[PDB]
Amino acid sequence: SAVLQSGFRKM
Amino acid sequence: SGFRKMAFPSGKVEGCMVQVTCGTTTLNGLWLDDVVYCPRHVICTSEDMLNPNYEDLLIRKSNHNFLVQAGNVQLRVIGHSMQNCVLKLKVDTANPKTPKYKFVRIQPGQTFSVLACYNGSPSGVYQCAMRPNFTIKGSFLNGSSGSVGFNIDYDCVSFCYMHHMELPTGVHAGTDLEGNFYGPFVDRQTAQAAGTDTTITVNVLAWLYAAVINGDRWFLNRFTTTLNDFNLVAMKYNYEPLTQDHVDILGPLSAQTGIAVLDMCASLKELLQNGMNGRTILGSALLEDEFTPFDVVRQCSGVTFQ
């Protein structure tokens, strides 16, 4: 499992 | 004196990065002139983030949904693109703070100062070292995709890295600002891991030069060994093989400290077999390899950057 980075940002 | 992870100053790179938002997936992207570089997986949502198809995903996306934030000032998008692994969003304005830059792909072993940034703002800096398996032991958390691993030579920044992902083992991987990916990895959630790691010999030698210059001379010994014997003993000890051009690149250090390359090379090969024996070198009890000879000569002589 290769985690992939991103920001989980609302709205 | 002294010797630490002397990371490059980051003022010329802080002001040239923006946040990149599309849909609910957000990440930070580098901003140069009228172009905003961001990882291509910005478009992917967690629903379809495993084995995606970027060619049609970009087609579905438009100019309006690519919303980029230059910190507080709202930024307008007037274009889009997708080269090998990174988008190339264009913006109406041109960044005042863009420094002299050049995208440089660096061979394994070269070190650079990463500007770890979360939600489009600087968070910290430190020197990574691109291991032979094309992975950097970064310190990145969620929202870090796009933290450029810049590098400053003569006041011209040389963006040589752009973070994309981790690995199950715990290391990170990313593309150069050109877009061509670093190593064999792919940008999908597929089970994906790096090969065996190899300690970089030239960086160890540069670190030992720093040790000798900083008054640490206990590991030096009269013994001297030839290049090929050292290569084999390092091979049985998982070190990257030493070639003559490396001895060439250590030349300035050898001249400065007065110690021949092969002398400390035999010292190192004896150190590996005998072990560290307990007493430390510059506060490290392990053969630390993240200093290139350029970094050592930079830190032990003093180089201007302005």
Add this chain to the structure above:
Amino acid sequence: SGFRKMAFPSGKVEGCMVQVTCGTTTLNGLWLDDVVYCPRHVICTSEDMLNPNYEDLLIRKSNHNFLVQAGNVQLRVIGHSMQNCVLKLKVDTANPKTPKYKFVRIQPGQTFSVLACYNGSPSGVYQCAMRPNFTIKGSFLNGSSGSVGFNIDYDCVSFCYMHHMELPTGVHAGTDLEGNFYGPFVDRQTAQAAGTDTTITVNVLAWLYAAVINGDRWFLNRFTTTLNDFNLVAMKYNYEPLTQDHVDILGPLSAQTGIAVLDMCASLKELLQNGMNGRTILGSALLEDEFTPFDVVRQCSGVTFQ
């Protein structure tokens, strides 16, 4: 997901440092607002370096004798001053890039990200820890004095240090921007060996907490040790004694990782007695003691700065 000596971004501090020149001697100087904070020994020459008379030396030097360069722009002094050991040269203009500065002192154990500058220009950054003997294991060369070791709380710069001299053992000494030395020092080239050094226990505990958080749990053990027993073990092992206040500091780390403070105090007690057993933690065979719990939380929770 990794953990390295991650130092604060420096763009807010790079543009606030200038050259200060008094005759032959030139060195770094912080340029907050219209004041240029430079160390006392700018006036002092090599001839009168040992046991100087700063009170008379400053009187002997006039305003025009103080040559201050902001990179290429020439600065004109409109007056000077003298706090405890730092000068307060004023300039005609006011730095546009001055951030929200806040002069503070730091108790031994607090860490800050220095901005080692040579010839009035930023050169690099790293995290130093104010050791209990009031010295920092810096990486400074000749001409680096006045290179402030700053700190960023949330959005404001919080200058904590200002490099002045070097010690024969290799460590360095400096002042707050107020001017008072850290510990028992004098500003003269006289025998000034610092006292014995003690490993900072709370920082070691924070480092171990970071190690637990980043997937390393091998050193954790069932056995639990009370605080007083831990202190009586640690004093013979040179570690600084642990107090209830420190345990209160580690509260967020204990809550986040779920591990009780005393359990990992016992783990550190066992680790420190038998030894590292020859397998590293976070790529270190010796216990790191330069990570504050605030820094660990900052690096493992994505704190924002802008």
Add this chain to the structure above:
Amino acid sequence: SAVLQSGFRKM
């Protein structure tokens, strides 16, 4: 023999 850092700049 405490060293005291400063720059050796001519003119």
